[PDB]
Amino acid sequence: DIIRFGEVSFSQLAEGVWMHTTYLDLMGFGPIPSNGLLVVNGDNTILVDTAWTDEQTEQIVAWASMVLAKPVRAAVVTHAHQDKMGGMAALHGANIATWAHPLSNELAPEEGLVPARNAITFDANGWATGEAAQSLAPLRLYYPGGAHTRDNITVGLPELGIAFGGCMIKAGDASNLGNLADADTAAYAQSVRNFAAAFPDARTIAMSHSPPEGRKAIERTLDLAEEL
């Protein structure tokens, strides 16, 4: 079931938790879907990942404030690629506090992308702490290590049993890990393992480029990551 608003497709994964999907024909080979989340916190929403473009990101922001009546107050992006950070400028124009891994902010300019305004502090165990943890709660943010990119992070909602693997996690029937141009192939398997252990009980596994699934998406991804 899907609500289509402008260029955006919204699906409810759980109460207060929506998925947004937008498309871009990145390389002329056909439109590519990209998935993020909208997480309701009281009278507002947390945005996980932008759409591909400013204009698509603006449509997400308007949907949250005008249809959900839960305007976006903070956003976190899962690494410095265009499907996850392409609309950063629209967020900053709306004066929305934005958050990323410190390495995503270093890498974004060379990628043609705008850095977030805040660095997430991750503790020595890979969990967010400090201002990021407090402001983005109930979301739990976890850095699993290098995989799809060196800066990729993951976000979880343990109470609801939902964990979002970003672009690191691929579908349970994947034949490949998608775009490895900036991947960390040596660490990929272990970082999948860390993520699986960071959210050991979540049964709903969401990811950037295919719809939500069960934990087999982790199993297939690790299998693929192990034969790199």
Footprint on this chain of a second copy (rule: CB under 8 A):
25-30, 32, 170-171, 174-176, 178-179, 181, 209-210
Which positions lie near Zn ion, rule CB under 5 A?
81, 83, 167, 208
CB of residue 149 vs a second copy: minimum separation in angstroms? 13
Of 132 and 171, the one with the shorter C-beta distance to a second copy is 171
Pinpoint the alpha helices (H) of 113-162: 130-136
CB of residue 208 vs Zn ion: minimum separation in angstroms? 4
- Residue 55: phi and psi, rounded to 5, are -60, -40
Of 198 and 206, the one with the shorter C-beta distance to a second copy is 206
Of 58 and 151, the one with the shorter C-beta distance to Zn ion is 151
Q: Is residue 202 at the binding interface for Cl ion, with CB under 5 A as the rule?
A: yes
- Between the two ends of the chain, the Cα-to-Cα distance in Å is 36
Looking at this protein, which amino acid is placed at residue 206? Answer: A
Q: Is 12 helix (H, G, I), strand (E, B) or coil?
A: strand
167 a known binding residue? yes
Q: Is 133 helix (H, G, I), strand (E, B) or coil?
A: helix
14 contact, one of a second copy, Cl ion, Zn ion, none, CB 5-8 Å limit per kind:
none
Q: What does the alpha-carbon distance between residue 198 and residue 68 come to, in Å, rounded to a whole number? A: 30
Q: What does the alpha-carbon distance between residue 158 and residue 119 come to, in Å, rounded to a whole number? A: 23
Binding mask 130-169 for Cl ion (x = CB under 5 A): ----------------------------x-----------
- Near Cl ion by CB under 5 A: residue from 1, 110, 201, 227: 201
Q: What does the alpha-carbon distance between residue 197 and residue 92 come to, in Å, rounded to a whole number? A: 34
The tokens for 183 are 């991947």
58 Cβ partners below 8 Å, 6+ apart? 87, 90, 94
- Near Cl ion by CB under 5 A: residue from 199, 207, 208, 217: 199
Of 58 and 83, the one with the shorter C-beta distance to Zn ion is 83
Which of 140-143's residues contact partners 24+ apart within 8 Å by CB, and which partners? 140/199, 141/76, 142/194, 142/195, 142/198, 142/199, 143/101
Residues that bind Cl ion (CB under 5 A): 158, 199, 201-202
Annotated binding residues, written as ranges, equal: 55, 58, 79, 81, 83, 131, 134, 148, 167, 182, 209, 223, 226
